[PDB]
Every structure is written in structure tokens, then in C-alpha cells.
Homo-oligomer: A and B are copies of this chain.
Amino acid sequence: GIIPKKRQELMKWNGWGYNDSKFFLNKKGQLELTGKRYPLSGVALPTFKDWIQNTFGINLDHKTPSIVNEDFLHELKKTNISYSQEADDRVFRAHGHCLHEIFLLREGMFERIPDIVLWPTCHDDVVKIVNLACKYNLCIIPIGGGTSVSYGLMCPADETRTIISLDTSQMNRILWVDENNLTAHVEAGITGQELERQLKESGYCTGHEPDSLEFSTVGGWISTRASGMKKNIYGNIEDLVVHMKVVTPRGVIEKSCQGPRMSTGPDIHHFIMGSEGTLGVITEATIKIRPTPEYQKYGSVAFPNFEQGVACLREIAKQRCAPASIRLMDNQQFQFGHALKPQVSSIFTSFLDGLKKFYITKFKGFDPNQLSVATLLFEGDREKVLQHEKQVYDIAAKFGGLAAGEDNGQRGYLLTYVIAYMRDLGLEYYIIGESFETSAPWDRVVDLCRNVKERIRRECKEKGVQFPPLSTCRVTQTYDAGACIYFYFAFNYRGISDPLAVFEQTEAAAREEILANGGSLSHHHGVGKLRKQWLKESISDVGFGMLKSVKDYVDPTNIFGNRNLL
């Protein structure tokens, strides 16, 4: 679970995830995932090829130096801090996981990359590096897991200083577990996977489960205001983090006491949370923990349509009895999920006809090209969980909801960690895309989803895309005041002059549409360098200027020079 220093040894140098895990055609011409990492790994998906071909109209056969100061260098040796000027170590840490970046990793090259990589192993190391960076006028860009989807890691082209990629992966210990107060103090480089694993050996968990938890780190979560799948029980990162230590050019930031709630002026933890590497390195953090849940239970519910589903989720929110996780997928995602089942279709009956017949006895009177499905996960004490399950199934019944089986439920949940591997699959077959998200008030969700989807159609048609894009959404989180809506956008770029440009423009147009329908700039992805142009409008000129005042104070010479946010 520890990220090794030469990452490409275990991880794909040119896309998401582990080397051992990729989609391939098996000996029977069926898509399948290699390796044994996931429960879907090594499982034939016989209907997946057909769903891809139907959805995108492709056949699926035809395919696609280090400038550094010597005095600094000499001083860095005294430290014993491990470092590297190797091109592959630098290029690996020159990007996150936005589409354009993955393309420059593949057929091309980055304009700017880190000049050198350092691997601090403790808070004190980080202090020395930041001291050295003051002394030699270095730029620093921290990296944890490298999972940013906001251009949060890209080196600005015109940065002339020596860029240090300050890799926190080796700074990864649980320093203490306080069982009395239910907190764990950890180093910021620990990955979510490794954090839960170790805590579990003591009987504990954080329950903070973002989809990137295999590689995303405690310090990255804090930096980007990360959200996890089980936020309803455990909180998002701002509810979970109770203390932190941050190294800035101006000094260390750390509160004295760990009183559970304070009134001592504006809460400085929130100046840092969401700071996106522009202020310093978060080195250690104290995070709330919980007894590992005794029992988990999956479920799923089908509704006549998306609108009915949304209203049910709204009512669940209203009664404040959301489960650990509830997600409502639109019809396309329901069909996609059907397209991963193991039943082998006759080549003479369409996708849609097997679907209709499959759900004819099961979902009566439901239109199969209109229906939507909520997946559900419950956890806690068995007796509590089962009580709560009945409560939730009884509310959903009032919106036309029909219980669709724990199997759909469990399936949706496992699939979450494998979806990110589909980009690479898509890329080999001229299919590009990206996920994006917003949060919106309850009263805007249905119109927002509908208009955002239709904006994507219109803009793809107008730019020359030959087939109507995949354009699907789901509701991933509920709150009192609204919801997180999460979208996928994908298309075949065959015929297109400049496919990245077209993706670019269409993703911007979507964001315009989102905001115009009362949605937020971001729910959890952050701003990075992707959404800077809307920031001022979203937080106000004065709010923007207050962010700048904190930045100019703690980092006056702009050492933490990723240029995210401002």
C-alpha cells in the first residue's frame, strides 16, 4: 500500500492505476480486465464490446533537461533527503488525470516538468526543503497521489525557477491512534488504502472513501476538499480533520489544543483546507476514526424515471435518514451496468431486447429506457442497519420505487474502482472523455441535469462530432440543501480536425451551463488551473482578494508556485 519511489515499477506511466490491471480482448473476443486486484479482475464481460460498439459506432479491432544549482544540490546531500533528476521520475510527477495531460503523456511532451524530485520522510525534512527553497529561490509543487483532475499539478510553462516536485509518498506513518478520543494522527503522505488497512488492524476506520483512495493521500484530501462515498456517516474531509500541521515559507501553522469545537476567531484550518498546494505543505493531520462497522448491506431500488428518483432522494434527505451511501443513476448508466453482466447474448437479439425481456416480469409497467436505479450501502451494527434499510425501502416505495436486488447494489459499488481504467480502453479505440461534477440546490437538480446533457449534445453536433455523445449523470451525494451531480461525457473523435480542442470547448460549455442552472463551480474536484476563470465570480472580488492576502502573507515570494486558484 506504500507508493514506492520509482512509481512506474508498479503504476502505469501513461494512464490510470496499476500496471497489472488493463482491459484486453480475451481468447474468446470478450473484454476482460487483467490481473487479480479487483473482484471484476479476470472476469469476462461478454456484452461489454457490443455496448461500446452500439454506443460509439466503432468496431473494436482497429486500434491507435534538468536545470539545478550546485550549492543547493550540495546542501541537499547533507540532508540525506532522497532525490532524483531522472526524466522519468520527473515526467511521472508532471501531471494528474485530466484528459489533455494523459495525451501529452502519450503521443507528445509537457512544456514544463519538475526539475528535481525530493522524497521527504518527515515534517522536519519538509522544513529543511522549504528553508532551502527560500535560500535558493526555488519553486515547490507538492504531490501526493498524483490524482488531481484540475491541472493542480501542471508546472506553469513560464516558471523559470527550479521546480522541486515535493513528493510526500514516503511520509506515511500513523504516528498515534488515540482510542479514548477516537482520533488518529498521521503523516500526510499516507494513502487512503494504506490508512484504512493499518487502522483496521486496531479495530478502526476513517470511512473516508474517495474513488482515488488507492493513491490519494491525506494531504491531498485536505488540499482539495475531498469528498468520500460514505460522507453521510463519516463526514467529508472538513468534518473529519480535527488538527493539522502545515509548513509555510513564513513558519509552521499548528493549533495548540485538540478541543473538539472552538470559538477562537476565524477557523484557520479552513484557510488551509482547499488551498491546493499554494500555501505550503501539510505534513501531519489528526483525523476522526470510528470502530470498524460490524455489518454492511447492499441494496438497489428502481424508479419509473430519474425525476421520481430525485424526489425520493430529496425525501430521504428531508427525513435525514440517508444510508452510508446512496446514488441515483440515470437510464444510460442503468443500461451500462446491464452491459457488464455475465449472461451471453444471442448475436441475433439486440442489446435492448434482452434488456426488455430481462426486466419484463421483474419491473412491471416500468419503461426500460426511462427507469432509474438507486444503489445503496448501509453499515454499522447489524440490527441498526436492517432497521434503517426497511425505513429507506419504505420511503422509496412511496415514489414508485421497487426493490431491485442486493446484487445490483454490490455490483455498482465494486465497479467504482474499475471505471477509471476505461479511459485507457477508450483511448485505444478513438474514444475520449472525462467525468465532471457540481453541487446544486434540490430545486435545480432535474433541470440542471437535463440542460447540461442537452448542452453537451448541441455543442458536439455543432463542432462536427458524428455521433451523439455519451452524456450521462448520477446523483452521488445528498445534503440538506441539495445534491452532488456527477456527469460522464464521452465521444468518438473520428472525423475531427482537433479532438482535444473540441473536448476542451465542450467541457467549458458544460461548466457554463452548470453555473447558469444554479450549480457550483465544483463540489469536490477543486479549481486547480482548470476553473480559475470562474473563481472571482463564484467567491466575489473581495473574497478572491482575501484569498490573495493570505497567500501573499504566508508565501510572499510565491514559492508554492503551482498557480492554482489565483
A residues with CB within 8 A of B: 178, 180-183, 224-227, 236, 238, 242, 248, 250-268, 270-276, 288, 318, 438-443, 477, 479-484, 515, 518-527, 531, 535, 537-543, 545-550, 552-554, 565
Task: Tell me, in angstroms, the Cα distance from A526 to B264 when the chains sit together.
Answer: 5
Of A264, A438, A480, chain B has the most CB atoms within 10 Å of the CB of A264
Indicate which residue in B250, B443, B538, B545 contacts A542 across the interface (CB closer than 8 Å): B250
Asked if A276 and B270 make an inter-chain contact with CB atoms under 8 angstroms apart, the answer reads no
Asked if A259 and B523 make an inter-chain contact with CB atoms under 8 angstroms apart, the answer reads yes
Closest residue of chain B to A479 (Cβ to Cβ) is: B260
Q: Count copies of this chain in the complex.
A: 2
Closest residue of chain B to A231 (Cβ to Cβ) is: B261
Task: Tell me, in angstroms, the Cα distance from A522 to B265 when the chains sit together.
Answer: 10
Contacts of A439 in B (CB 8 A): 259-262
Task: Tell me, in angstroms, the Cα distance from A550 to B525 when the chains sit together.
Answer: 26
Contacts of A225 in B (CB 8 A): 262-263, 267
Task: Tell me, in angstroms, the Cα distance from A531 to B265 when the chains sit together.
Answer: 11
Closest residue of chain B to A480 (Cβ to Cβ) is: B288
Task: Tell me, in angstroms, the Cα distance from A537 to B255 when the chains sit together.
Answer: 8
Contacts of A518 in B (CB 8 A): 257-259
Asked if B265 and A270 make an inter-chain contact with CB atoms under 8 angstroms apart, the answer reads no
Given A182-B318, A442-B181, A540-B253, are A271 and B260 neighbors across the interface (CB < 8 Å)? no
Contacts of A275 in B (CB 8 A): 265-266
Q: Apart from A261-B439, A263-B527, A264-B522, what are 17 other A-B pairs with CB-CB below 8 Å?
A: A181-B442, A225-B267, A226-B263, A238-B267, A242-B481, A259-B438, A259-B482, A259-B520, A260-B481, A260-B482, A263-B274, A263-B524, A264-B521, A265-B275, A266-B270, A271-B271, A271-B546
Asked if B539 and A268 make an inter-chain contact with CB atoms under 8 angstroms apart, the answer reads yes
Asked if B440 and A259 make an inter-chain contact with CB atoms under 8 angstroms apart, the answer reads yes
- 9 tightest A-B CB contacts, nearest first: A259-B520, A549-B553, A259-B439, A270-B270, A260-B479, A260-B481, A260-B482, A225-B263, A180-B443
Closest residue of chain B to A235 (Cβ to Cβ) is: B480
What are 21 A-B pairs at a CB distance below 8 A?
Answer: A180-B441, A180-B443, A183-B481, A250-B542, A253-B546, A255-B543, A257-B520, A257-B521, A259-B523, A260-B480, A262-B439, A264-B274, A264-B522, A264-B526, A264-B538, A265-B274, A265-B526, A265-B539, A266-B550, A268-B543, A549-B550
Contacts of A538 in B (CB 8 A): 255-257, 264
Closest residue of chain B to A526 (Cβ to Cβ) is: B263
Closest residue of chain B to A259 (Cβ to Cβ) is: B520
Asked if B479 and A522 make an inter-chain contact with CB atoms under 8 angstroms apart, the answer reads no
Contacts of A250 in B (CB 8 A): 542, 545
Asked if B522 and A262 make an inter-chain contact with CB atoms under 8 angstroms apart, the answer reads yes
Of A255, A262, A527, chain B has the most CB atoms within 10 Å of the CB of A262
Asked if A260 and B441 make an inter-chain contact with CB atoms under 8 angstroms apart, the answer reads yes
Indicate which residue in B262, B522, B526, B535 contacts A520 across the interface (CB closer than 8 Å): B262
Given A441-B260, A540-B252, are A547 and B274 neighbors across the interface (CB < 8 Å)? no
Contacts of A227 in B (CB 8 A): 261, 263
Asked if A266 and B259 make an inter-chain contact with CB atoms under 8 angstroms apart, the answer reads no
Task: Tell me, in angstroms, the Cα distance from A440 to B256 when the chains sit together.
Answer: 12
